[PDB]
Design a protein around this ligand. Structure first.
Ligand SMILES: CCCCCCCC/C=C\CCCCCCCC(=O)O[C@@H](COC(=O)CCCCCCCCCCCCCCC)COP(=O)([O-])OCC[N+](C)(C)C
Ligand SMILES: *[C@@H]1O[C@H](CO)[C@@H](O[C@@H]2O[C@H](CO)[C@@H](O)[C@H](O)[C@H]2NC(C)=O)[C@H](O)[C@H]1NC(C)=O
Ligand SMILES: CC(C)CCC[C@@H](C)[C@H]1CC[C@H]2[C@@H]3CC=C4C[C@@H](O)CC[C@]4(C)[C@H]3CC[C@]12C
Ligand SMILES: *[C@@H]1O[C@H](CO)[C@@H](O)[C@H](O)[C@H]1NC(C)=O
Ligand SMILES: *[C@@H]1O[C@H](CO)[C@@H](O)[C@H](O)[C@H]1NC(C)=O
Lengths: 663, 42
């Protein structure tokens, strides 16, 4: 009855006390919009388990007898045997199936919640902003009365059938999707986003084609991608909330998630956030579409009647019991820590690198994109001193450890116990990783002189061996693209910034004839190791380097120096001086199949254009059919291995080739 | 073994990754024998 009561759904007299806030948050609401989200979340988690949770690739990931460096969050979390990890994933599948149907919904929520967060914390490199969100939406829904409408719990239990839910089941769910949107909009106020650097390639997609009619493509990436994703994420939960702007807001966030379903392969994120945006609507909206259909159809649909009263709400005439005070407490406390954990990065400073905090829980999607130039992992034997070199990615199943100091300390520790199986007694492992974030200068992210096995990492101390991101060389990025545009189709360039006192030992391969180093800023001293000859360069001086030999670039400036490697691959150039000599004589013997393996690939990448959409889609459902069939058949192999036992290997072999069959 | 590299390939500097989107997983060090150890001759 006031102006604010029609606008926010409550007046300030409902916030006058704790009892009036418990009464407001446990106000009886229609169960219908909460229980269509329960289906659409529990159905998109049934699909997510063989695809993105890794049930279909569980035999390749959690295989027994495999030397592997794992990255759990808590290091005491060890994965089970592969036979039991197929039971964790079929408990999580029955949990997402009983959350979808609403069958034993309190039991089926903790059958999905508990093995999801076991699997989620068992790999820090599988953390996304959506796989974190699906474990948040399944955490809230454990406590919500989502089986109060359109469930088989309504059919079995008669007092759960079409009964009222409290208001806090929506104020948490709307408050979560507002926090997902709005905090992502102030993570995108970074200088890499408002200047048009993160997702600079994204406007070259074909889905940004109508914006090219009015703007340039230089300005389509700046306005539509960067400022259009800022001013949508900043104001999505403001548009969806209020009644005057919801239909404008529902259209802008339906388009924003139908674009991101094709621009990126992020799992079910674009369909979970599409199924969540109708929680901001009026909670009666499934009943308002049930009534619009023909008359005998609604006996397969849920009931269109008014909801019966429930014990879970606070009604007007009732003193609120202990359950109703645990819903006004779960709403305020959890939406406080959902506003805090994207900014809790001053607390967990051991997880802090060039970007703040560990990835997954901060809603900074696409804000920071990396490109690695060089990883050099150098062990050193404990009883000999043999300075040897490891492969860059030996026992890891991921490449996220080279960005994060917590994972590099996990990789260096795991390599300290795995290398004695390869006659390295106690290694001293040094990581030399060159990352450039958002088209910047390539620099070392970690110090290459620190022994990471004995280096000190703790979760709440800022790490000593992480090099600072040189943000005073971020003005240079307009000049670096000017140099990249100045080059022809043949020469490539690697821009590199190095710290004082450090050097870069590069081995120019013999394929790279005519390579050279031009100093842009600072003062380096290029050593040629084969001749043992130095040459000090200053700003603007070029210097040619030999192919097939070693050279070292010693930084001798008191400030960080910057240079570039303008190289050309004269081996593949002389290969295309012969293959582009060979094709013109074709329309008139090691090299002839290398021409033919490129005329081979010219056949099938062109019929990527010449295939129809309906058979593209038919092949994509075949792929999906095979990823849902292998995940079902390799589960039954490992579910027989626990009940009936494990048979002979020749009979295990017959089933796995049967499971790996294309359908 | 295959867990090591020489000092000509580990020292080659020349030779966009957003962390949000969701493959190799079988190019491991001792994969094909530890697969046939737990499974059959697949
Ligand atoms: C500027 C800030 C815009 C911020 C937008 C945040 C979205 C969070 C949604 C909370 C909410 O739905 O309010 C609910 C309770 O609200 C309360 O219980 C009082 C607040 C207690 C804390 C809840 C989190 C805030 C109101 O319930 P509703 O009647 O269903 O919603 C209003 C109806 N309407 C949407 C048509 C207007
Ligand atoms: C070329 O110059 C570099 C830069 O000073 C020399 O590198 C130094 O080498 C000594 C002995 O190996 C080390 O103690 C120094 O720490 C190195 N300097 C830096 C900055 O690390 C290199 O020896 C010179 N080479 C020749 C042949 O003169
Ligand atoms: C060990 C096996 C049984 C799995 C047990 C699951 C436990 C560890 C899971 C289940 C529910 C999870 C919580 C769900 C929601 C959140 C909010 C999030 O922003 C921080 C983590 C936090 C607080 C989780 C902590 C870990 C948690 C308690
Ligand atoms: C090496 O490449 C650069 C790139 O422009 C070119 O200017 C130079 O002439 C080349 N030198 C030789 C010897 O090919
Ligand atoms: C140069 O091109 C050849 C292809 O002929 C390739 O094998 C080689 O790796 C390239 N050089 C570098 C340094 O990548």
């Amino acid at each position: 009855d006031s102006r604010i009561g029609k606008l926010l759904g409550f007046e300030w007299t409902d916030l006058s006390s704790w009892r009036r806030l418990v009464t407001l948050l446990n106000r009886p609401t229609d169960p219908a919009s909460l229980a269509v989200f329960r289906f659409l979340f529990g159905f998109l988690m049934v699909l997510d388990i063989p695809q993105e949770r890794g049930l279909s690739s569980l035999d390749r990931k959690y295989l027994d007898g495999l030397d592997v460096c794992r990255f759990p969050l808590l290091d005491a979390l060890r994965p089970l045997p592969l036979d039991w990890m197929y039971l964790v994933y079929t408990i999580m599948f029955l949990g997402a199936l009983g959350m979808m149907l609403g069958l034993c919904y309190r039991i089926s929520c903790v059958l999905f919640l508990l093995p999801y967060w076991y699997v989620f914390l068992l790999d820090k490199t599988s953390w996304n902003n959506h796989s974190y969100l699906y474990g948040l939406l399944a955490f809230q829904l454990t406590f919500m009365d989502a089986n109060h409408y359109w469930s088989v719990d309504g059919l079995l239990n008669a007092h759960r059938r079409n009964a009222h839910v409290p208001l806090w089941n929506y104020a948490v769910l709307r408050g979560q999707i507002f926090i997902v949107y709005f905090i992502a909009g102030v993570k995108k106020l970074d200088a890499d986003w408002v200047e048009g650097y993160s997702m600079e390639y994204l406007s070259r997609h074909w889905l940004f084609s109508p914006f090219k009619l009015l703007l340039s493509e230089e300005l389509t990436s700046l306005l539509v991608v960067h400022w259009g994703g800022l001013l949508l994420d900043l104001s999505a939960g403001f548009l969806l909330f209020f009644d005057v702007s919801r239909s404008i807001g529902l259209f802008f966030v339906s388009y924003f998630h139908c674009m991101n379903s094709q621009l990126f392969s992020i799992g079910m994120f674009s369909y979970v956030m599409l199924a969540s945006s109708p929680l901001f609507c009026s909670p009666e909206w499934p009943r308002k579409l049930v009534s619009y259909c023909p008359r005998r159809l609604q006996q397969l649909l849920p009931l269109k009647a008014a909801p019966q009263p429930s014990v879970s709400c606070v009604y007007k005439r009732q003193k609120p019991g202990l359950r109703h005070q645990l819903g006004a407490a779960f709403t305020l406390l959890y939406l406080l820590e959902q506003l805090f954990l994207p900014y809790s990065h001053f607390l967990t400073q051991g997880y802090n690198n060039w970007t703040n905090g560990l990835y997954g829980y901060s809603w900074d999607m696409m804000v920071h994109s990396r490109s690695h130039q060089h990883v050099k992992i150098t062990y050193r034997d404990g009883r000999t001193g043999e300075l040897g070199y490891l492969n860059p990615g030996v026992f890891t199943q991921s490449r996220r450890w080279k960005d994060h100091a917590d994972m590099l300390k996990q990789y260096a520790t795991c390599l300290s116990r795995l290398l004695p199986k390869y006659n390295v007694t106690e290694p001293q492992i040094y990581f030399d990783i060159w990352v450039s974030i958002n088209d910047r200068f390539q620099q070392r992210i970690f110090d290459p002189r620190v022994d990471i096995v004995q280096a000190a990492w703790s979760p709440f101390q800022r790490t000593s061996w992480v090099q600072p991101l040189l943000m005073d060389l971020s003005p240079w990025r307009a000049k670096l693209q000017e140099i990249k545009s100045s080059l022809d189709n043949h020469t490539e360039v690697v821009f590199i910034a190095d710290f004082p006192g450090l050097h870069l030992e590069n081995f120019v391969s013999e394929d790279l004839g005519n390579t050279s180093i031009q100093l842009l800023q600072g003062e380096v001293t290029v050593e040629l190791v084969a001749e043992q000859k130095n040459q000090t360069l200053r700003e603007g001086e070029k210097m040619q380097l030999p192919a097939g030999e070693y050279h070292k670039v010693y930084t001798t400036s008191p400030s960080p120096s910057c240079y570039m490697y303008v190289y050309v691959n004269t081996t593949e150039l002389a290969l295309e001086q012969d293959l582009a000599y060979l094709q013109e004589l074709k329309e008139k013997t090691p090299l002839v199949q290398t021409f033919l393996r490129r005329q081979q690939r010219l056949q099938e990448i062109e019929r990527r254009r010449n295939t129809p959409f309906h058979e593209r889609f038919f092949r994509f459902l075949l792929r999906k059919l095979y990823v849902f069939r292998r995940s079902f058949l390799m589960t039954c192999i490992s579910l027989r291995n626990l009940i009936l036992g494990r048979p002979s290997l020749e009979q295990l072999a017959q089933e796995v080739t049967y499971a790996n069959l294309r359908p | 073994g295959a867990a090591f590299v020489s000092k000509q390939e580990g020292s080659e500097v020349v030779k966009p990754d957003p962390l949000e989107p969701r493959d190799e997983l079988a190019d491991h060090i001792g994969f094909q024998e530890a697969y046939r150890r737990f499974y059959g001759p697949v």
